[PDB]
Amino acid sequence: EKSVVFKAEGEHFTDQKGNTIVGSGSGGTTKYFRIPAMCTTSKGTIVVFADARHNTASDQSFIDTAAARSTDGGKTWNKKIAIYNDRVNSKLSRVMSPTCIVANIQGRETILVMVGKWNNNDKTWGAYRDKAPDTDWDLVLYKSTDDGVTFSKVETNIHDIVTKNGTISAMLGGVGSGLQLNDGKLVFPVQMVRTKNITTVLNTSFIYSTDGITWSLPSGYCEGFGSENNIIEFNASLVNNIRNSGLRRSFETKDFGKTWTEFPPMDKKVDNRNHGVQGSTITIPSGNKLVAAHSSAQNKNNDYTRSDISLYAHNLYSGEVKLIDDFYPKVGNASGAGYSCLSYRKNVDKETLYVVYEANGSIEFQDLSRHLPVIKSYN
Ligand SMILES: CC(=O)N[C@H]1[C@H]([C@H](O)[C@H](O)CO)OC(C(=O)O)=C[C@@H]1O
């Protein structure tokens, strides 16, 4: 009814030289996985990224970005490390929080994946506000043009545009998936930690590009809330959907990121309760209309266990919301739980809706395509 993408205490990765990575799971396995991100290509291939937390579930720990690839509809997976941390600090070196896009970049189908990178910081990234930007931080971008088989680093100007801004201590993708606009523009939702002198600690925004190499920041900022967020393209707006303790928040920009205003069809429509949680938000066509599909946790215990990871439909015209499927109807592991990522595709006449999510330190996959008629009708 499901498959395991990455098995907690059940995977063995190799490093760049081909030596095994001895984690703290049983038998020297990778201990824990978090923060899944997925896409589906024009060939039907599914690629899933996650934080491979070799030693512990903690955010401040030794982490590589794993990638899993399935060509059989999610039944079986081939796995590797896509992005290695710098191996400065055996406790703390890390790459974190993947956000991915599958896109047509000047004719070439490309998977992009963006992760934050730290080495010696022993605290959460929001603690580091003294510098513009933090010297321990980077935001790195990798690509594949071979359907997810190989990844290579992309040289970008992302660090430069953050430095030039001068009011950002660190930036990170919004977690899960970014998007390619109908005109071809690449867009990553972002989270930013502002420098200490800015009265808002966190903001949301996006970065955009034509070629995947040269990126830009818009001039405005959206309120941060819990900062993890996704963007959809709708009706001549970019619309975000942001983590927040309690009710999720959604804003729209009609001027390509200069200004943001509340988006009534999604704002305050789903409750994640205490702490909030990352959620995934995408669009799915229905005729010449769109529906938003959204995944996040109901959090019945009002805590970090983030129970009941659920799929919702948002009617973008009426503002109705309904629960489609509580696809992980379980209490999570409070060491780190609740995150998810959706992926919709129509290849020829075959429509697929997939999800990956956190399940007790593992990453699981489900094919949710049977729900498509219900979601599409919600317009
Ligand atoms: C880069 C990073 O730390 N990401 C982490 C994120 C973050 O700490 C929080 O959004 C405050 O910034 O929180 C969580 C979480 O399970 O809630 C998981 C992520 O691994």
Structure-determination technique = X-ray
How many distinct structural domains can be found in the chain? 1
DSSP bridge partners of 78: 69
Breaks (C-N over 2.5 A) in the chain follow: none
Task: Identify the bridge partners of residue 7 per DSSP, sorted by sequence position.
Answer: none
Reading the block at residue 153, the tokens are 């680093």
Task: Name the amino acid, one letter, at 374.
Answer: V
Q: Which residue has the tokens 């996704």?
A: 230
Is 339 a catalytic site residue? yes
Residue type at position 283: T
Given its phi and psi angles, is residue 183 left (phi above 0), alpha (psi -120 to 50 degrees) or beta? Answer: alpha
What residues pair up with 358 in beta bridges, in sequence order? Answer: 363
Say how far apart CA 337 and CA 272 lie, in whole Å.
Answer: 13
Long-range contacts of 301-306 (CB under 8 A, 24+ apart): 301/331, 302/273, 302/274, 303/274, 303/275, 303/334, 304/274, 304/275, 304/332, 304/334, 304/337, 305/331, 305/332, 305/333, 305/334, 305/337, 306/272, 306/277, 306/332, 306/337, 306/338
Which one of the listed residues 51, 59, 147, 325 is annotated catalytic? 59
Cross-strand bridge partners of residue 341: 356
Ramachandran assignment for 73, one of left (phi > 0), alpha (psi -120 to 50 degrees), beta (any other): left
Q: Is 134 in the pocket of ligand 1 (CB under 6 A)?
A: no
Beta-bridge mates of residue 70? 46
Residue 55 and residue 45: Cα distance in Å, rounded?
30
Residues 6+ apart with CB under 8 A from 211: 105, 106
Report whether 114 contacts 99 (CB < 8 A).
yes
How many whole angstroms separate alpha carbon 309 and alpha carbon 296?
5
The residue with tokens 């799915």 is 284
Q: Is 130 a catalytic residue?
A: no
Cis peptide before 133 (omega within 30 of 0): yes
Probe ligand 1: pick from 117, 124, 358, max atoms within 8 Å of CB?
Answer: 124
What span, in angstroms and rounded, lies between the C-alpha atoms of 122 and 91?
Answer: 9
Q: Is 56 in the pocket of ligand 1 (CB under 6 A)?
A: no
Task: State the Cα–Cα distance between residues 100 and 210, nearest whole angstrom.
Answer: 16
> What residues contact 164, with CB distance under 8 A and at least 6 apart?
none
Closest residue to atom 7 of ligand 1, CA basis: 124
The two three-digit tokens of residue 111, written as one number: 């998977």
Q: Structural domain of residue 43, as residue ranges? A: 3-376
> Which amino acid belongs to residue 128?
Y
C-alpha distances (whole Å) from 309 to each of 37, 71, 167, 314, 371 are 15, 25, 35, 16, 15
> What HEC string does the chain produce?
CCEEEECCCCCCCECCCCCECCCCCHHHCCCEEEEEEEEECCCCCEEEEEEEECCCCCCCCCEEEEEEEECCCCCCCEEEEEECCCCCCCCCCEEEEEEEEEEEECCEEEEEEEEEEECCCCCCHHHCCCCCCCCCCEEEEEEECCCCCCCEEECCCHHHHHHHHCCEEEEEECCEECEECCCCCEEEEEEEEECCCCCCCEEEEEEEECCCCCEECCCCCEECCCCCEEEEEECCEEEEEECCCCECECEEECCCCCCCEECCCCCCCCECCCCCCCCEEEEEEECCEEEEEEEEECCCCCCCCCCCEEEEEECCCCCCEEEEEEEECCCCCCCCCCCEEEEEEEECCEEEEEEEEEECCEEEEEECHHHHHHHHCCC
Ligand 1 centroid vs 108 CA: distance in angstroms?
33
Tokens of residue 328, six digits: 């992980």
Say how far apart CA 113 and CA 313 lie, in whole Å.
26
Q: How far apart are the first and last CA of the chain?
A: 28
180 CB burial (10 A radius; 0-12, 13-18, 19+)? middle
Q: How many CB atoms lie within 10 A of CB 123?
A: 10
| Measured distance CA(374)–CA(32) in Å, rounded | 34
**Count of C-beta atoms within a 10 Å radius of residue 320:** 13
Please tell me the residue having the least CA distance from ligand 1 atom 17.
277
Rounded to whole angstroms, how far apart are CA atoms 56 and 289?
A: 44
The CATH number of the domain where 53 resides is what? 2.120.10.10
Give the residue from 282, 227, 268 showing the smallest Cα distance to 37: 282
Resolution stated for this PDB structure, in Å: 1.0
Q: Please state the length of the chain.
A: 379
